């Protein structure tokens, strides 16, 4: 209605395309650099019909749209923060406990420790690892002995779990273990999904029957032969997959022997581990989502220094994302300041490198800033400009080091810079090419080849070849007096004699003479 009627009725056709008119007769926040092109595109060119393509199409900013989703405060208090942090520690604990349940994680740690000793107190390592190994070898015996039907044996197992929970592993180690268990589980469900895909679809066995049958042992062939001997219509098809199912069961039993665990519970421990992961991850996400304000607030001070606002607040977000990981609620120190440092370090360790086109090390950046901070006083504490010699004198560095330092400053200048203000000038247009050779020079080089190729013609074979091979021309790889003296019997001095005699021959011709210059 408003926009359409005004635009159409007015522009008929506004003669000189009066742009500075209807752009004020539009709503929303003005002075944008976005809506402009959408008006200079419709008026002319595809006239008449374009004015009908405009309304039908008419029927914004990164930061402003970022503050929008950040608007969802969900702010916290000391109670809230400690709560979330508590959930984090709870999740982490359940995960680590789930790792303790895994015996192969313990035995692998044992194996890799023996690898460590086979090449942080060395005796302390030999101490704790001895404790772990001791509890393991005592718990291991209480397994096949079956004394105390996994009641008190379970107590020794859980005590072994506690012993394992005493070890403070490295992030790479924990991740490797967890990933190993998930890959193991990947093979487990690989075999299970294999058996199911083969028996259910290929053999036309209903999913009800497969869940009723397979869920039992899942390893022994007691369920498979009982599925075949059920005399069902889908039992006769199982014969065409007997070897496949057998292979899957044999491999799953192999996994049972690998983990040394009950196959009907590995899903349980892996499940709880997954539960812990999701919980801790969720809680940590809530943390970083909550302290989102701190990032932008402190990032505001670092603005305008070779990196835009979004990039800064982004490095601050990842800085905060790192701060949340290393923190506990059982600490007198709050999160508001501890996170602040990690954020400052995060963005300052980004502005340091990824700012200028050319590389630069941190010490360089610090030295440069220090030089600036010092220089701003010499011209203010005296009255005249700061001389480079005196400015270098007030520092530990000599002077030439500072000279070379200033040759690294600035982006620097871009080619698209206007200069003479012609029609229209560009700095990069005055930059001459030097890697190319003059056509004159190339012509002289070609004529040089011809000249030499014609000069070695007035020579003998045992002299042309000598000069040619010695100074290496028209044969790539040049040889020495020995490699030429061997292929011509007489060695060294003889070939050098001839080599000089040819040069003696070149004292009258003028061709190469003028080609010299």
């Amino acid at each position: 209605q408003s926009q359409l009627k005004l635009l159409v009725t007015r522009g008929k056709e506004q003669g000189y395309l009066t742009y500075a008119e209807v752009n004020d007769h539009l709503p929303e926040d003005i002075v944008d650099s976005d809506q402009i092109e959408d008006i200079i595109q419709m008026i002319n060119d595809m006239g008449i019909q374009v004015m009908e393509e405009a309304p039908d199409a008419d029927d914004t900013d990164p930061v402003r749209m970022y503050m929008r989703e950040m608007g969802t405060v969900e702010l916290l208090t000391r109670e809230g923060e400690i709560d979330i942090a508590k959930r984090i520690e709870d999740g982490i604990n359940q995960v680590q406990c789930s790792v303790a349940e895994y015996p192969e994680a313990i035995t692998y740690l044992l194996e890799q420790y023996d690898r460590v000793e086979a090449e942080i107190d060395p005796e302390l390592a030999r101490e704790k690892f001895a404790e772990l190994r001791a509890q393991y070898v005592v718990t291991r015996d209480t397994i096949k002995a079956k004394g105390r039907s996994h009641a008190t044996a379970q107590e020794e197992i859980l005590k072994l779990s506690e012993v394992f929970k005493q070890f403070r592993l490295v992030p790479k180690q924990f991740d490797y273990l967890v990933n190993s268990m998930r890959v193991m589980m990947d093979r487990v469900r690989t075999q299970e999904r294999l058996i199911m895909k083969l028996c259910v679809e290929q053999c036309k066995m209903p999913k009800k029957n497969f869940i009723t049958l397979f869920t039992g042992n899942e390893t022994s062939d007691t369920w498979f032969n009982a599925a075949i001997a059920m005399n069902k219509p889908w039992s006769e098809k199982l014969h065409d997959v007997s070897e496949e199912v057998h292979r899957a069961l044999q491999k799953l039993q192999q996994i049972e022997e690998e983990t040394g665990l009950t196959i009907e519970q590995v899903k349980d421990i892996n499940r709880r581990m997954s539960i812990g992961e999701a919980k801790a991850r969720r809680a940590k996400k809530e943390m970083v989502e909550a302290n989102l304000r701190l990032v932008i607030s402190i990032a505001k001070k670092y603005t305008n220094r070779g990196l835009q606002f979004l990039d800064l607040i982004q490095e601050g977000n990842i800085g905060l994302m790192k701060a949340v990981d290393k923190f506990e609620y059982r600490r007198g120190y709050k999160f508001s300041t501890y996170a602040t440092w990690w954020i400052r370090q995060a963005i300052t360790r980004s502005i340091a490198d990824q700012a200028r086109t050319i590389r630069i090390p941190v010490h360089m950046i610090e030295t440069i800033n220090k030089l600036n901070r010092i220089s701003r006083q010499m011209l203010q504490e005296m009255g005249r400009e700061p001389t480079p010699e005196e400015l270098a004198e007030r520092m530990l560095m000599p002077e030439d080091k500072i000279r070379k330092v200033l040759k690294i400053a600035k982006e620097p200048i871009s080619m698209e810079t206007p200069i003479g203000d012609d029609e229209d000038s560009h700095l990069g247009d005055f930059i001459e090419d030097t890697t190319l050779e003059l056509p004159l020079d190339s012509a002289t080089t070609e004529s040089l080849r011809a000249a030499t190729h014609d000069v070695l013609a007035g020579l003998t074979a045992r002299e042309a070849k000598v000069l040619r091979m010695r100074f290496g021309i028209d044969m790539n790889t040049d040889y020495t007096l020995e490699e030429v003296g061997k292929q011509f019997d007489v060695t060294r001095e003889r070939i050098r004699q001839i080599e000089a005699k040819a040069l003696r021959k070149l004292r009258h011709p003028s061709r190469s003479e003028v080609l010299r210059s």
Binding site: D34, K285, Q314, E416
Partner: protein, 1160 residues
């Protein structure tokens, strides 16, 4: 069994979308680091924007580290660093790519007038398509319940609908969401169902969007491009050399902005990749994705939305698109200040010694080494660097018959660049022949011209056979001579006539040449008397040859001696009996038409020599007593001021209308100005008394100034009238006229007041000149852009129809005849004769045979003539239908370049056009060519019927006229405003006037006829040149109007889809191939459509040609969408590619290659 896999000759180029794998095909590696050059070693980093392994090595043949150096390993890569050691130009041609994490929308295919990604998907651009991919409002990707297929949801709506159903209508948000949208879209099935739905019971209430989108979808699906490529997942990288960072002077590197862009996008992309592996907060990751979008869009094309800044410069960064959206320097060239060279011929120019020495450097080298002297090439260099006498003689050998073409700054027409034979001159200025000094519009105020050296053999022959001055005798615009003698020489030959009575006269008779001896030996004067001599004339007829004719005519000394210059033929004597004025050019013209090129050329040199010499002998000057004022000046001034005094007194006592007494008193001073002007001229014209024999007689003043005026030589009535008479009515900044004209004149003193009044005229004069000078070229550009593609081809077609040519007669009420507009024109068919026979069918009206059109009396003033307006040609112009008008006397050679020469000739005299029911001037010309509707368009009767009122103001309304007869009615709309011209009941014809006002060219073409509308345009555009007094042939106007009527509109039913407005090119060629193909009913009838220069030029086949003038960002985009290909016949697009031009010396090449591209 060809199928070659090398870089051979190409017949066409193709443009289309690029698949991610298509990008990988160009990828010689992947940029992974924002690093450019080392901070210390200044050496290319590993996988940065300037890698050596990916792109190319720094030095020519040595690798990065230095394990391999010379040409030993030019095919093998290095062991320590995989750097292919070839050239350094490799670094200029190597591509490379970046593979982004989450998908990114291409800024062009996103927001470029019509949303290509939107219109293809049928979805709002900056409204919905923005909010759904900027992570705000989730969109659906096809649902089989409750939700449609492309609706927009909020997070709340998302979870609500997900709770209601879910796990069976999953639809993401953002870039990859739009990707799944375009990917899921079935172009084929939609192309069918859309055709089904958008045709069922719908009038003109829907057909618009229907036909539009269906044509668009059919185009895209047939293009071959998959909509998946619309938003890219792999972004290619520009070669390093095309965006280098080269160290300037003493450090301070110089880089391109693209490095900043690529560095930013790389950084943001890497952070995104890192965040998609670490903790993944939805707000953080989605924000970084939007930031990646920002970086990518900023790199591809800034435009457009705020403009990414940085780089310390407060100015934006030059993105890729900005480097290809919107002067060809050349070697073997130079320039210098020009100077007159009287001793030269017409085919020669003064080229400075040192200048020509440096120019023909390589030629001097070759010739030196060829003869001897220089033992080698470098010897020649050292030999010319040390200018050693003999080298100059060698130079005299190399420039012998090696043409050099000269050029002036403002190149309006073809005669801007003309070739000459280089003549070495001891000096540092470039000398020019004073005859061709007018074609350049060049003066010697200090103007400077440039010189070019035709290097190629055929380039030298092109300059000699085409651009040589001796071949450019006649102007391409009008058949009249262009190298015609100017001021100095004409005043000379004017002085070589001018019969003065007695004064060492008497009729002492002799025989031509002997008179020369008489003149040098004094005794007799020169301008007497008259005197008689024996003239041996030469004429030819029928069987050509030559026929002598000795007689005794009464000429003068000047005419006698001047007769020696006149060539063999010509009517003789009578051409000299006149004087020197305009016949000075007429004589040259007739000489050319009855003799030929050479005789005319040598005649031109001779008349130039003669004019200069005798002008110098005359010694005409300009003393203060040369501009004599009239004695009646003060009288007339007093009388005029008396009359105006009475009028002012009358105004004082009421009586006369004081409101407009201003106008009538202006008429008083205007009359007085004409009185002083007439008095001054009648005085300064005749005067004198002499004393013939018995004394007492009168001739015409020998008053220098008058001699200059009565013989061209820059001296007009108005200027002289201001010199001795008076400067008339002066303009006022208001636009009004001052009621106190400059009574005084330049011969007299000028008061401070009236000078401060005249300063306005001078100011607005110079200012207006500065405007129309640029405005003229501004029009020329549009003319060329629309016309520079048609060239005379297919020899001479058939057809007879063509506009009936008739003398432009304003003589209806003002008397003004012009009947030379038919000459060198090819006749339609035997245009009758008051009796029988006469004119043949295709006989081109000769220059002597148009003079035969006067032997058929004043009765025959109408002849049908073939024109470029008609001509049943396809993609060119019939040689016959065109004409012949060139510097050449014959018809245009097959494969010329009619378009550009036409445009040039039209926009050349634009410099002398005064901008403003009569607009008049250059603006009038522009409006006529643009075919714009007037501010008060008249109305015509579409079908002949009976005029009657259709409900007196019953709408709406506003009157209504309804001419109904025979069958079916029509209801035109009259808006009360403006009256009428036909009462009720009266009958009208097909296209009668019923508004008596300005006519609209659209209505004329649509109803009256093509011959009528073209006749209108030419006869209306000429009328604005009549007033300005600029001669220009109608052929060129007809030429631009030809392709001004390029496209039409079909209205019926054929293989072409109705509503589509297409050019009569494809139309005619397809209707000719349908009447005898299967059935004439599978095709419709078209209708010519009038469209302006800009609207016509806007449409063109090649996308490169379009990418030249019109908005590149648009044309390149839309041409990218539909798999288009230029192949490849246009001039402009074949110019920027740098190949042979499909015209002139080319054409033959294009024809051979064109037929060659018929095998496959």
């Amino acid at each position: 069994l060809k199928a070659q896999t090398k870089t051979e000759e190409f017949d066409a180029i193709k443009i289309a979308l690029a698949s991610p794998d298509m990008i990988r095909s160009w990828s010689f590696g992947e940029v992974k680091k924002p690093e450019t050059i080392n901070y210390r070693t200044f050496k290319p980093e590993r996988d940065g924007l300037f890698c050596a392994r990916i792109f190319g090595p720094v030095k020519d043949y040595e690798c990065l580290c230095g394990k391999y150096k010379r040409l030993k390993h030019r095919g093998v890569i290095c062991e320590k660093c995989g750097v292919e050691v070839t050239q350094t130009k490799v670094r200029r041609e190597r591509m490379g790519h970046i593979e982004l994490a989450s998908p990114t929308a291409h800024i062009w295919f996103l927001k470029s007038l019509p949303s290509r990604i939107g219109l293809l998907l049928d979805m709002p651009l900056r409204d919905i398509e923005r909010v759904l991919y900027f992570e705000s409002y989730v969109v659906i990707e096809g649902g089989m319940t409750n939700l449609e297929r492309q609706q927009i949801l909020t997070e709340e709506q998302y979870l609500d609908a997900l709770e209601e159903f879910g796990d069976e209508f999953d639809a993401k948000m953002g870039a990859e969401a739009i990707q799944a949208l375009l990917k899921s879209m079935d172009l084929e099935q939609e192309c069918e169902q859309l055709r089904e739905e958008l045709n069922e019971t719908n009038s003109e209430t829907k057909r618009k969007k229907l036909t539009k989108r269906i044509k668009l979808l059919e185009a895209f699906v047939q293009s071959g491009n998959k909509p998946e490529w619309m938003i890219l997942t792999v972004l290619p990288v520009l070669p390093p050399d095309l965006r280098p960072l080269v160290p300037l002077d003493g450090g301070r590197f110089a880089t391109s902005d693209l490095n900043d862009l690529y560095r930013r996008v790389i950084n943001r992309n890497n952070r995104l990749k890192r965040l998609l592996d670490l903790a993944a907060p939805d707000i953080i990751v989605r924000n970084e994705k939007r930031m990646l979008q920002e970086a990518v869009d900023a790199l591809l094309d800034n435009g457009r939305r705020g403009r990414a800044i940085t780089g310390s410069n407060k100015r934006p960064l030059k993105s890729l698109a900005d480097m290809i959206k919107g002067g060809k320097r050349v070697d073997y060239s130079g320039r210098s200040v020009i100077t007159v060279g009287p001793y030269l011929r017409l085919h020669q120019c003064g080229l400075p010694k040192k200048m020509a020495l440096e120019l023909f450097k390589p030629f001097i080298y070759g010739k030196l080494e060829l003869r001897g002297l220089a033992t080698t090439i470098k010897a020649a260099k050292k030999m010319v660097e040390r200018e050693e006498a003999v080298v100059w003689d060698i130079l005299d050998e190399v420039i012998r018959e090696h043409p050099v073409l000269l050029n002036r700054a403002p190149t309006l027409h073809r005669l801007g660049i003309q070739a000459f034979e280089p003549v070495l001159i001891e000096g540092k200025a470039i000398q020019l022949h004073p005859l061709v000094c007018a074609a350049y519009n060049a003066d010697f105020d200090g103007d400077q011209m440039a010189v070019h050296v035709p290097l190629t053999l055929e380039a030298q022959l092109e300059a000699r056979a085409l651009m040589m001055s001796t071949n450019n005798i006649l102007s391409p615009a009008n058949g009249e001579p262009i190298i015609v003698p100017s001021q100095d020489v004409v005043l000379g030959l004017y002085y070589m006539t001018r019969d003065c009575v007695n004064a060492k006269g008497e009729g002492m008779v002799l025989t031509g040449p002997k008179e020369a001896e008489r003149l040098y030996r004094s005794g007799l004067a020169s301008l007497h008397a008259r005197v008689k001599v024996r003239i041996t004339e030469y004429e030819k007829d029928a069987n050509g040859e030559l026929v002598a004719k000795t007689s005794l005519k009464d000429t003068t000394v000047g005419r006698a001696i001047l007769w020696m210059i006149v060539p063999k033929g010509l009517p003789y004597s009578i051409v000299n009996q006149a004087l020197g004025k305009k016949a000075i050019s007429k004589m040259l013209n007739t000489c050319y038409r009855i003799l030929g090129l050479k005789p005319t050329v040598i005649f031109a040199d001779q008349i130039m020599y003669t004019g200069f010499a005798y002008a110098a002998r005359s010694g005409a000057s300009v003393g203060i007593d040369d501009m004599v004022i009239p004695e009646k000046k003060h009288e007339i001034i007093s009388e005029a001021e008396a009359e105006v005094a009475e009028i002012q007194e009358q105004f004082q006592s009421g009586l006369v209308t004081a409101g407009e007494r201003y106008n009538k008193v202006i008429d008083i001073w205007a009359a007085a100005n004409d009185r002083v002007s007439k008095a001054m001229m009648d005085n300064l014209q005749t005067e004198t008394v002499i004393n013939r024999d018995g004394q007492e007689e009168k001739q015409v003043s020998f008053n220098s100034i008058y001699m200059m005026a009565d013989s061209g030589a820059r001296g007009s009535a108005a200027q002289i009238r201001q010199l001795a008479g008076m400067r008339g009515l002066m303009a006022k900044p208001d636009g009004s006229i001052i009621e106190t004209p400059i009574t005084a004149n330049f011969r007299e003193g000028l008061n401070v007041l009236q000078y401060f009044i005249s300063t306005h005229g001078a100011r607005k004069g110079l200012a207006d000149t500065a405007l129309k000078t640029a405005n003229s070229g501004y029009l020329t550009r549009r003319l060329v852009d629309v016309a520079q593609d048609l060239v005379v081809t297919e020899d001479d077609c058939g057809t007879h129809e063509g506009i009936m040519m008739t003398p432009v007669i304003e003589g209806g009420d003002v008397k003004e005849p012009l009947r030379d507009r038919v000459l060198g024109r090819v006749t339609a068919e035997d245009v009758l004769k008051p009796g029988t026979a006469d004119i043949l069918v295709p006989r081109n009206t000769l220059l002597h045979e148009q003079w035969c059109d006067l032997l058929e009396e004043n009765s025959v003033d109408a002849v049908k003539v073939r024109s470029v307006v008609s001509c049943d040609t396809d993609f060119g112009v019939c040689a016959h239908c065109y004409g012949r008008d060139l510097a050449r006397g014959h018809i245009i050679n097959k494969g010329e370049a009619i378009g550009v020469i036409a445009a040039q000739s039209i926009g050349e005299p634009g410099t002398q056009l005064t901008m403003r029911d009569i607009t008049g001037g250059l603006p009038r010309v522009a409006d006529l060519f643009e075919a714009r509707r007037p501010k008060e368009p008249a109305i015509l009767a579409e079908i002949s019927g009976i005029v009657s009122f259709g409900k007196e103001t019953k709408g709406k309304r506003r009157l209504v006229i309804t001419p109904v007869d025979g069958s079916d009615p029509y209801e035109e709309m009259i808006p009360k405003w403006r009256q009428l011209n036909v009462f009720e009941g009266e009958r009208v014809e097909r296209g009668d006037v019923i508004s008596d006002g300005p006519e609209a060219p659209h209505d004329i073409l649509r109803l009256r006829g093509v011959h009528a509308v073209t006749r209108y345009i030419v006869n209306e555009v000429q009328d604005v040149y009549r007033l300005q007094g600029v001669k220009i042939n109608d052929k060129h106007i007809e030429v631009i109007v030809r392709q001004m009527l390029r496209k039409a509109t079909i209205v019926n039913a054929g293989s072409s889809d109705f509503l589509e407005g297409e050019q009569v090119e494809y139309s005619r060629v397809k209707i000719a191939n349908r009447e005898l193909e299967a059935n004439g009913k599978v095709g419709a009838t078209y209708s010519r459509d009038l469209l302006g220069i800009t609207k016509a030029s806007l449409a063109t086949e090649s996308f490169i040609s379009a990418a030249s003038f019109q908005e590149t960002t648009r044309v390149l985009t839309e041409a990218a969408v539909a798999g288009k290909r230029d192949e490849l016949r246009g001039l402009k697009e074949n110019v920027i590619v740098g190949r042979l031009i499909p015209a002139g010396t080319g054409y033959a090449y294009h024809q051979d290659r064109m037929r060659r591209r018929a095998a496959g």
